[PDB]
Write a protein that binds this DNA or RNA. Structure first.
Ligand SMILES: [Mg+2]
Ligand SMILES: [Mg+2]
Ligand SMILES: [Mg+2]
Ligand SMILES: [Mg+2]
Ligand SMILES: [Mg+2]
Ligand SMILES: [Mg+2]
Ligand SMILES: [Mg+2]
Ligand SMILES: [Mg+2]
Ligand SMILES: [Mg+2]
Lengths: 110, 194, 117, 134, 59
RNA sequence: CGAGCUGGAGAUACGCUUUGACUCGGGGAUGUCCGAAUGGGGAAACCCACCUCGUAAGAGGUAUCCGCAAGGAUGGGAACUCAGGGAACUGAAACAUCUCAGUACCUGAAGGAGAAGAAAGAGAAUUCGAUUCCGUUAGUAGCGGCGAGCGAACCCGGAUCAGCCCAAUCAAGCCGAAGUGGCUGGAAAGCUACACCUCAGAAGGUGAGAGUCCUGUAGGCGAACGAGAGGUCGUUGUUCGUGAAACGAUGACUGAAUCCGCGCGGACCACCGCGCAAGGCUAAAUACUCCCAGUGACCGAUAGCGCAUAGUACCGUGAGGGAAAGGUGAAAAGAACCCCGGGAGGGGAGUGAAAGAGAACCUGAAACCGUGGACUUACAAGCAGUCAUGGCACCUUAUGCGUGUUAUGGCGUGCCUAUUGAAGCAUGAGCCGGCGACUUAGACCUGACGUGCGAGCUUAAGUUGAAAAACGGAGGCGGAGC
RNA sequence: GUAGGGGAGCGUUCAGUCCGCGGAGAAGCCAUACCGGAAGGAGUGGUGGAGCCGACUGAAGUGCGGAUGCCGGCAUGAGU
């Protein structure tokens, strides 16, 4: 039960965005959004990861082996932040699109 | 016998309760007040009746090492509670003389120290919340006290919203508790005052 | 609101239990039998506390007339002659004077003799 | 300050718990534990066997208005038919009656529903009038 | 109790109880003349203690 | 709504989405079979038919009950309402009247509410003016083996307040203010230094303790379509038990007047009042909680609903009864590889802050079983202790009035309950957890202490504000007794 | 000193204030020779891993050895 639905189960970020790490570890490191999971609040950035070993009863002469793969994340990160660091961007508006909004803090480029 | 912070004068009225600040009556008053607020909500299955159980058991005499009637009794597990809480009230009317003697005795209890009456709230300038911090700093409120504001004028109250500094009490709806709880009482609006 | 018995009983019990030490078997281990051992234990405590004084009385005396007899008198005779002399209100624990220091006790004997005939 | 706020100093004592008390096992040994039947009265013991009837009525009852009250203090505001409610007879429910208790000479004129003998024999000897409904 | 009103449990101004003399009331008479006027006023305050409680609120 | 989606599903594969998927508010369209089940049968979910259109496949109809027919009803619903029927244990310290009590239960009808209603009346002022509801009158009038007990109504204060006709805004959601450095740390939201917002410091999430990091909060906006008569006999009701028993109400016999008339006013009479029966409907204020929301001097895993979902397992032919059951980690990084073993299981390595978290994964008491150690024990009669001394071992509240263990001496009849009396050969109990018993209520009664006013003292229902409390004098208690 | 009456208090849950403490680690559990007239309360040391003392006031489902008491767990009879 419970589970990640504390937010409105909406994502402040998008699938194709560059994003950095607010606090946490690998502080301020950045990367492209890869996996965006809204319900469970999970984000995969190209940036941060682990070395995870595979238990493999059958894989290509199964003989199990180790891989190095990406650790998923919470809402903790900073989402598409232009002026060379992370900051909270609320504001919306229209620029070239009647049907579309955009995002900024002090600036207007995401 | 007290000053106003902006504009006029007055507050030389209001003979204060005698003797000055009797805390027994105070205690009586607040205790009554919390008691008034107290909302009885009782989750208890008291009776062997409340909980769900079929009631005839097994042999009385002759089973041995036994002795029981039913599974719903309080000497059992899962069963009813003997003397658990029920949905009551505990709200009464404290005699009115003391109801009005109290708050007066509180205001009186603010004459060993700081209290304030104000007029001319126009120094607030809409709300902005900032100008309340200003108004405070100029009127001597460090915000290292706890403050209660009693006034009308929604513009003037709504300037104050925060946990640290202040709390707000409209239309002279004052509580002996609320004012005795906070450090500074700003009696502000001089309507109920004087 | 309810108050579960939690950590209250346990504490008390643990205290009782700790009072039980070199107690044999069940006594030292499980509560009830410990506690109820400690009732009779009370009885013997206070009563023997009033008692050990009767006990030591007995012991000291039992030494004193022993030495007296080594010198030719007895407790009856020795304290009779000693106290017959307003000289000795000496009394208490005098046993160790008979035990440790013989010559002294001898002098007290002869004193008890001069206080007789 | 609520935390420096004291007690009543002797309004209440704590309640009564019969749990514990190391040798409390409460009430009476046999007989009269457990029951909701105690019941001090009842026809059994010396109430019946007691011999009365008479009969119940309790008809008209009147406000007792002390003379001492009326005289002495106030103004002799000439009590009459209305102001009297503020004079503390307060009843309604019943008519008003005047009786003689205190003595002071005064001119007084009062509307009540009835009065006693030495009442009218008092009010007039000091001068005055006492009205009665026709 | 609520029966005892018109019968004399009756309460005085000193908070005492009116119970007088029963000696013979109706049946079985034909002794003297002042045992017949033996009907009294009277009371005791031992069982007056719990008596009023029968009559309690309605004085 | 604007990037994800492919149900709890943990899982691989196939794929869908900006030509707006998924999710959310709104309609429609499909909807096997059983069940009021209704073509007929039937051991519910199966078995057999028949009529109509046809191009087979397929569609429609085929129960009964009131009607011109349109059209209505069959059944279901926790509790709430009215109605037909109606107990007993129990109290009376036994028991017939009585009480329990028109209580429980059965049954019938209906709705979101019901019931009840527009005076042949209350009532004693020639006042009031439909019903219901709350306060109060009041334990008062009264009822009663005049026992146990039962117990009104008018007045008055309110919530809400209408009589009218027949027969001669909330709904999906969008918008939304304000922080960086250094520091401890595995991890910052904590500490520190400066800084800002606030009609927004309610709350939750985020590796720990959050105004300014996410979601939100105040505020603002927000739709196509959608919802807002008389008597007699037998009886009984209300306080009404046959009592002087009036009046309503019928079961059986009877059976008048109609406006110079009729019913009432507690036997009855005359005065005197109040009313005009035999025809119907009538929101509102009242009751309840299947259900949704919000809060709590409510619980937090023997509690709390039976259930941290199960009426399941499990018991019973059946009606019916009926369980216990929670926790890796912040994150799966959930342990590749190696060793002993068929395995189970563990030992390394590695991930991790921690594996003193390893999936018999939070803590981890006690009973209970062991392993090692210290001091001890194989002539001693033992409620297991207690005191006194000696030996021996140990020195973190701790070299002393020590701590542990012991040998000897003295003393020493478990606990509880029930009792004239208990070590009792009298009850209870295997041991340890955990659960487990003097309570709550009422405008009650009486007393003690304390407080406010004080010959005065107070409000109840309710109204109004409700982070908060004021108003509300109907009434109650003193004040005169016999 | 038994029923019984009177007086002072200890401890536990919740609530309002007050003061604060905690990842350089909360409660809980473990041991312990110290404190107090008792209920009891601290000192430090070991466990633990997310919370909690102290003070005042108020409210209680508030204190267990018993009830052939209740749920559970684990013993004895026995390697019989
Ligand atoms: Mg007993
Ligand atoms: Mg030492
Ligand atoms: Mg006992
Ligand atoms: Mg006895
Ligand atoms: Mg025995
Ligand atoms: Mg025996
Ligand atoms: Mg064998
Ligand atoms: Mg054998
Ligand atoms: Mg054998």
């Amino acid at each position: 039960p419970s589970a990640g639905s504390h937010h409105n189960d909406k994502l402040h970020f998008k699938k194709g965005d560059t994003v950095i790490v607010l606090s946490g570890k690998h502080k301020g490191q950045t990367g492209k959004v890869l996996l965006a999971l809204p319900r469970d609040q999970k984000v995969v950035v190209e940036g941060v990861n682990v070395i995870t070993k595979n238990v493999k009863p059958s894989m290509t002469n199964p003989q199990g082996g180790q891989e190095q793969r990406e650790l998923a994340l919470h809402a903790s990160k900073v989402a598409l932040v232009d002026p060379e660091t992370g900051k909270a961007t609320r504001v919306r508006k229209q620029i070239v699109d009647g049907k579309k909004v955009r995002v900024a803090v002090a600036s207007g480029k995401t | 016998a007290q000053i106003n912070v902006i504009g006029q004068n007055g507050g030389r009225t209001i003979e204060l309760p005698l003797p000055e600040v009797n805390s027994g009556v105070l205690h009586e008053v607040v205790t009554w007040q919390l008691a008034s607020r107290r909302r009885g909500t009782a989750s208890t299955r008291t009776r062997a009746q409340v909980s769900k159980t079929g009631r005839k058991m097994y042999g009385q005499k002759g089973t041995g090492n036994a002795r029981h009637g039913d599974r719903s009794v309080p000497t059992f597990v899962g069963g009813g509670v003997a003397f658990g809480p029920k949905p009551r009230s505990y709200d009464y009317t404290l005699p009115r003389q003391v109801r009005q003697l109290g708050l007066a005795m509180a205001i009186a209890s603010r004459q060993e120290g700081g209290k304030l009456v104000a007029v001319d709230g126009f120094d607030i300038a809409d709300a902005k919340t900032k100008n309340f911090i200003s108004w405070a700093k100029q009127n001597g409120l460090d915000g290292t006290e706890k403050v209660l504001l009693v006034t009308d004028d929604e513009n003037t109250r709504r300037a104050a919203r925060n946990v640290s500094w202040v709390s707000v009490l409209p239309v002279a709806g004052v509580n002996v508790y609320d004012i005795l709880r906070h450090d500074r009482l700003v009696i502000d609006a001089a309507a109920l005052e004087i | 609101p309810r108050a579960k018995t939690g950590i209250v009983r346990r504490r008390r019990h643990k205290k009782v239990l700790k009072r039980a030490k070199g107690f044999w078997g069940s006594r030292s281990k499980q509560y009830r039998n410990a506690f109820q051992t400690l009732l009779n234990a009370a009885t013997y405590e206070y009563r023997d506390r009033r008692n050990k004084k009767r006990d030591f009385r007995r012991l000291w005396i039992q030494r004193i007339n022993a030495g007296a007899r080594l010198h030719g008198m007895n407790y009856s005779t020795f304290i009779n002659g000693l106290k017959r002399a307003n000289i000795d209100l000496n009394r208490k624990v005098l046993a160790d004077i008979a035990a440790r220091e013989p010559e002294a006790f001898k002098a007290l004997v002869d004193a008890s003799r001069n206080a007789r005939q | 300050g609520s935390r420096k706020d004291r007690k009543r100093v002797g309004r209440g004592p704590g309640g009564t718990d019969k749990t514990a008390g190391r040798g409390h096992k409460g009430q009476k040994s046999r007989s009269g534990a457990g029951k909701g039947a105690f019941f001090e009265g009842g026809r059994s013991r010396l109430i019946a066997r007691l011999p009365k009837r008479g009969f119940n009525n309790v008809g008209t009852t009147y406000e007792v208005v002390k003379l001492s009250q009326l005289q002495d203090l106030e103004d002799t505001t000439f009590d009459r038919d209305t102001l009297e409610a503020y004079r503390l007879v307060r009843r309604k429910n019943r008519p008003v009656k005047l009786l003689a208790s205190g003595e002071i000479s005064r001119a007084v004129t009062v509307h009540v529903d009835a009065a006693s003998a030495a009442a009218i024999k008092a009010v007039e000897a000091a001068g005055g009038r006492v009205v009665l409904p026709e | 109790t609520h029966k005892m009103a018109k019968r004399r449990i009756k309460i005085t101004g000193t908070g005492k109880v009116m119970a007088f003399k029963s000696g013979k009331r109706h049946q079985n008479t034909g002794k003297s003349g002042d045992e017949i006027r033996g009907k009294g006023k009277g009371f005791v305050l031992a069982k007056a203690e719990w008596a009023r409680m029968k009559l309690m609120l309605p004085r």
